[PDB]
Paper text:
Phytochromes are biliprotein photoreceptors widespread amongst microorganisms and ubiquitous in plants where they control developmental processes as diverse as germination, stem elongation and floral induction through the photoconversion of inactive Pr to the Pfr signalling state. The principal role of phyA is to detect exceedingly low light levels by integrating photons over prolonged periods, whereby molecules in the inactive Pr state are converted to and accumulate as the Pfr signalling state in the nucleus (the very low fluence response or VLFR). Here we report crystal structures of the chromophore-binding module of soybean phytochrome A, including ~2.2 Å XFEL structures of Pr and Pfr at ambient temperature and high resolution cryogenic structures of Pr. Here we present several novel 3D structures of a minimal soybean phyA(nPAS-GAF) construct as Pr and Pfr.
On the same basis, however, penetration of omnidirectional light into the thin, plate-like microcrystals would be adequate. In order to collect diffraction data for Pfr at the XFEL, we thus irradiated the sample in the capillary that feeds the slurry to the jetting nozzle with a 630 nm LED array, allowing ~ 45 s for dark relaxation to the final photoproduct before the sample arrived at the X-ray focal spot. Paying particular regard to the Y242 rotamer, the Pfr occupancy was estimated to be ~ 11% and ~ 23% for the A- and B-protomers, respectively. We analysed the global changes associated with Pr→Pfr photoconversion using Fo(light)-Fo(dark) maps and difference distance matrices. The largest electron density differences are associated with the chromophore region of chain B, consistent with the higher Pfr occupancy there. From the distance difference matrices, specifically chain A shows a slight general shift of the nPAS domain, whereas chain B shows slight shifts of residues K78-V110. Both chains show shifts corresponding to helices Q276-K286 and H321-D332 (blue and red stripes in Fig. 2b, respectively).
Numbering used by the authors:
A (entry chain B): 69 to 110, 121 to 345, 360 to 401
B (entry chain A): 71 to 110, 119 to 147, 151 to 345, 360 to 401
The structure:
């Protein structure tokens, strides 16, 4: 049941908007319902729209040029400007067979001159983290995980950061934790397997970093071309809305916002666990920082697998 | 020392402005800056020009904020009429804020963040390969460093150049494109690298020369400025004429040099030296990534001695 509704991914979070394009025609074959408002000035946006009508000439050309690379050759994000408004967005591209799917995340105008500076700064901080993991003496899973949650806490600014390990019966245990002062600790607690369905663990193998900005936000529908006789697969989107059971789960534990990083060993390939960030209030972090976190989690996974041996 | 610090020439691949640390107005500029930044009241660019007349408002605001600091480089700026974009690289000296401007292709502006992330990722992967090395073999450590830099930077030749106790140098590792003659193993006199150059490398850890044959450009300053403006910290500083000549005879038209400073007790261990047969330019984000790679390399060198 869970996998169907997560794979189709027809509901997104409202912090961004989504377009899907036909690789052959470059025209819009699906869009989220908030996309006309975000990207135009309400020359419309609908099924069949050409993207050269929406963005400035260098922007349209950069996206058009992405159509011609293999996915492993995609460099994200792309900085685009809207043609009428001048509004800037980060465009995050991925491919599913003959479709190109694009997530658009807003950028503040005063942030634009700092886009390269901020990207370098995020990766530099992550790189300094990697050196401290590596400097650590071997022999203690506990010290390794403490160092990791401490580094992530400083890098990401969330109220709570946990290392969550899966046991062989698939139930989980919180084995390391750092929080801001007032909060209730979860260190040492065990949780049922069913708190994280099989389908979610499966998706984490491919989508290694997941952000939920606000569990109470009103989700937005994706509309697709009525001519299509199948559903598009949108689960690779950075914007996919959380299933309502989990959004209800979040509100109950006063984690209004979250950032989760998969820890995949032998990347025998196995989901060892998760690094779980919670925030009491809504929180957004831009793509370059999440991208750096993905690499930090990869290196962490190498050290985890070393200690096992 | 006094025609590297008080020498007033830059390489022509970019241009330079210096601004007064209080008024924010132009107190020095390279002779190529008017055509590069305005396309040639008053001559649009001279002593006393206000940066609000040169750049779009978001661009000028971002530079005003930097004068208020802490520095994250580079800043992406657009010129006011042309919309012509540059990377602005900022540093401070006692009297002034100095800005090096390196051009960006207008149609590449959408990919600036993407390219910066990719540069740092490749350097971060190189860092993990150095770390995973079994300790004990200085040869293996240095061979790995030159291989990674070669792949990252795309230069024709990459060598590790070690300083001996008498300050003479030795090439102890090297990788080149096929068919180039090796220099591995050669010893060179201490005088090839004067002490003044060594002292600069302590502060400016990455130095790029795009084309030893390029015609250098003068920096003009107000003659009543109560101090002498130094260019030691500019990414654009011209090579000394002895070295421009030294490079031509050895068919290194372009170079990229990384200092290797241990106990960063502080001493210059050596250099990672990249050479190219033809002119070569690499953008600031890649040089910035190389700086961190060089610091991490220095730590492993220091470990090997001990
Ligand atoms: C509804 C009947 C059942 C249900 C479904 C469900 N859960 C998830 C996803 C996650 N569940 C967790 C669990 C935890 N988070 C924590 O912080 C802790 C320790 C305090 C636990 C145990 C996590 C981390 C996830 C991943 C969330 C993410 O991707 O950010 C899903 C998938 C949701 C989606 O839309 O991707 C579903 C469907 N949960 C229940 O408890 C019910 C039994
Ligand atoms: C002129 C009278 C003397 C002189 C001066 C001089 N040298 C440098 C700087 C450098 N010299 C070297 C030397 C080498 N490069 C190599 O590739 C090799 C081995 C194959 C050697 C021995 C290097 C690497 C530098 C640094 C250059 C840089 O910053 O990119 C300077 C500094 C130039 C400047 O303006 O910074 C000067 C003045 N060289 C001679 O040979 C004379 C004896």
């Amino acid at each position: 049941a869970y996998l169907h509704h997560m794979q189709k991914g027809k509901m997104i979070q409202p912090f961004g908007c989504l377009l899907a394009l036909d690789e052959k025609t470059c025209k819009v074959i699906a869009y989220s319902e908030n996309a006309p408002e975000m990207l135009t000035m309400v020359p419309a946006l609908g099924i069949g729209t050409d993207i050269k009508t929406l963005f400035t000439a260098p922007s349209a050309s950069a996206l058009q040029k992405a159509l011609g690379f293999a996915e492993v050759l995609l460099l994200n994000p792309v900085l685009i400007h809207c043609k009428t408004s001048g509004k800037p967005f980060y465009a995050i591209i991925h491919r599913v067979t003959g479709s190109m799917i694009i997530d658009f995340e807003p950028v503040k105008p005063y942030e634009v001159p700092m886009t390269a500076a901020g990207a370098l700064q995020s990766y530099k901080l992550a790189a300094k983290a990697i050196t401290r993991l590596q400097s650590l003496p071997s022999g203690s899973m506990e010290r390794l995980c403490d160092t990791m949650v401490q580094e992530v806490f400083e890098l990401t600014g969330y109220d709570r950061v946990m290392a969550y390990k899966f046991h062989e019966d698939d139930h989980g245990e919180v084995i390391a934790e750092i929080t801001k002062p007032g909060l209730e600790p979860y260190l040492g607690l065990h949780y049922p397997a069913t708190d994280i369905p099989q389908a979610s663990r499966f998706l984490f193998m491919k989508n290694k970093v997941r952000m939920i900005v606000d569990c109470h936000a009103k989700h937005v529908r994706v509309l697709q071309d009525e001519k299509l006789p199948f559903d598009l697969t949108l689960c690779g989107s950075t914007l996919r809305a959380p299933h309502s059971c989990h959004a209800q789960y979040m509100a109950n534990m006063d984690s209004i916002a979250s950032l989760v990083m998969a820890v995949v060993v032998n990347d025998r390939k196995r989901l060892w666990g998760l690094v779980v960030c919670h925030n009491t209030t809504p929180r957004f972090v831009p793509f370059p920082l999440r991208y750096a976190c993905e690499f930090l989690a990869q290196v962490f996974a190498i050290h985890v697998n070393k200690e096992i041996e």
